[PDB]
Design a protein around this ligand. Structure first.
Ligand SMILES: [Yb+3]
Ligand SMILES: [Yb+3]
Ligand SMILES: [Yb+3]
Ligand SMILES: [Yb+3]
Lengths: 85, 85
DNA sequence: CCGACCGACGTCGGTCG
DNA sequence: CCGACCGACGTCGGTCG
């Protein structure tokens, strides 16, 4: 349901997960490993590294946005998703 | 906007991406590397391996569901997501 | 079409300054 | 708080039967 996508360099996003899990565990539901959108040849990737963070509620997401610092050069987008099937 | 989450074993989902990219490229927008939800200790993961597949439109997603076979023991869920910020 | 398997390599958790 | 860096290892693209 309520989630955010955080993007940066792969190393950046990995180390960010480490500290979020360590210091701000109560501010989010779950978090993912680091992923990329794949491109067309071999192991090519497109775009920046990403993690997905889910929230229990939108209030929780707001708590997160207010309290967890975002390193320079990282970006965050927030979505709400309905199950289709 | 319109997406699906496909889950299975990590090897299962990787090999599935290989064939989807190879045979059914026109049936989807983009696809991700394989990811997991992390757990609480060391490199522990929770749940099955996942890939995210995006679609250009819901009609495209329907084309995909009708034409691309899903191996036994894999699962697919479909969502629609609105940008919050 | 499927996925165990190959060797390769980049992401892994963690450290530290 | 931040992220280059460490050595480790599991996911990587690809093969094949
Ligand atoms: Yb390319
Ligand atoms: Yb655990
Ligand atoms: Yb191996
Ligand atoms: Yb290295």
């Amino acid at each position: 349901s309520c989630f955010a996508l955080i993007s940066g360099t792969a190393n950046q996003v990995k180390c960010y997960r480490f500290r979020v899990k360590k210091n701000h565990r109560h501010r989010y539901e779950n978090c993912t490993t680091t992923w990329f959108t794949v491109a067309d040849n071999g192991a090519e990737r497109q775009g920046q590294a990403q993690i997905l963070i889910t929230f229990g509620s939108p209030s929780q997401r707001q708590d997160f946005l207010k309290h967890v610092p975002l390193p320079p050069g990282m970006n965050i987008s927030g979505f709400t998703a309905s199950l289709d099937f």
